[PDB]
Design a protein around this ligand. Structure first.
Ligand code: 9NH
Length: 261
């Protein structure tokens, strides 16, 4: 997995943040890659490499696959470059805009397939949303960046760190209890993003507004142009009781059929 740092040529910053940056570059000149570098101090070089180790163990068709690493400060995590960036951005570009519900549902099914495997392996995402879904040149999707429990859950630190309100389940917002079921709720919201081609969820509301209404049992209205059948699948994702929400396997199962229809 190790590669001399010389085989990498950074070219364009893609993302920056608390723990480092993500750059687009080349490996041995010909291979286009995405490189994540750890910001010295931001976090243990060990906890940083944890993400890589998880990646090796969690390889799958619909998940971001590790390519290589550089284990000397500054540590790098390298993956292959996904040409169309993040799903949420892709859906607003001319190509993404013209996509028919069929192609959209297929993509939704791919994500559901990725989540089924994650559920299968006893893991949780914690920050499932279109911004963390990557799209390749042939429009196949892959799930990326699990949300760090350190910054999203209840503990010493967050005690005052927070999360993406509009995508988070009621139980997680209130009691900080994140399970695969809250990832399911989240999937429901991700579903609306896809069908609306990137529109922000709960149009017309602020985060504190969302929170208030959620208590009264409020749920997003079916988007114009969203099949009513698909809509009721979303409603299953937003059931009040977590244990009442469907599994990704079923979701994956049901999405694949709307698509062959
Ligand atoms: C921005 O990161 C990328 N961006 C593109 N393309 C792109 C992005 C934007 C744009 N833009 C921005 C400019 N405007 C035009 C469009 C144009 C191309 N391509 C690849 C990456 C990419 O792999 N990133 C990446 C992701 C992870 C990661 O997920 N870790 C992880 C963590 C936990 C669990 C798993 C699991 F379970 F899933 F295994 C994981 F995998 C780790 C390292 C890296 C480098």
């Amino acid at each position: 997995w190790e590669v001399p740092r010389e085989t990498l040529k950074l070219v364009e910053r893609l993302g920056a943040g608390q723990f480092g940056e993500v750059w687009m570059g080349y490996y041995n000149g010909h291979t286009k890659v995405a490189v994540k570098s750890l910001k010295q101090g931001s976090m243990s070089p060990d906890a940083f490499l944890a993400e890589a180790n998880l990646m090796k163990q969690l390889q799958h068709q619909r998940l971001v696959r590790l390519y290589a690493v550089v284990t000397q400060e500054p540590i790098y995590i390298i993956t292959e470059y996904m040409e169309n960036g993040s799903l949420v951005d892709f859906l607003k570009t001319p190509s993404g805009i013209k996509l028919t519900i069929n192609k959209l549902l297929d993509m939704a099914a791919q994500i559901a397939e990725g989540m089924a495997f994650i559920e299968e392996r006893n893991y949780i995402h914690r920050d499932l949303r279109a911004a963390n879904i990557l799209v390749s040149d042939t429009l196949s999707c892959k799930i990326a960046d699990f949300g760090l429990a350190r910054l999203i859950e209840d503990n010493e630190y967050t005690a005052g760190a927070k999360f993406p309100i509009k995508w988070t389940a009621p139980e997680a917002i209130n009691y900080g209890t994140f399970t695969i079921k809250s990832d399911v709720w989240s999937f429901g919201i991700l579903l609306t993003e896809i069908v609306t081609h990137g529109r922000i969820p709960y149009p017309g509301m602020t985060n504190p507004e969302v929170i208030q209404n959620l208590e009264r049992g409020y749920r997003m209205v079916r988007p114009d142009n969203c099949p009513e059948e698909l809509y009721q699948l979303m409603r299953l994702c937003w059931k009040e009781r977590p244990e009442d929400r469907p599994t990704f396997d079923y979701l994956r199962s049901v999405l694949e059929d709307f698509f062959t229809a």
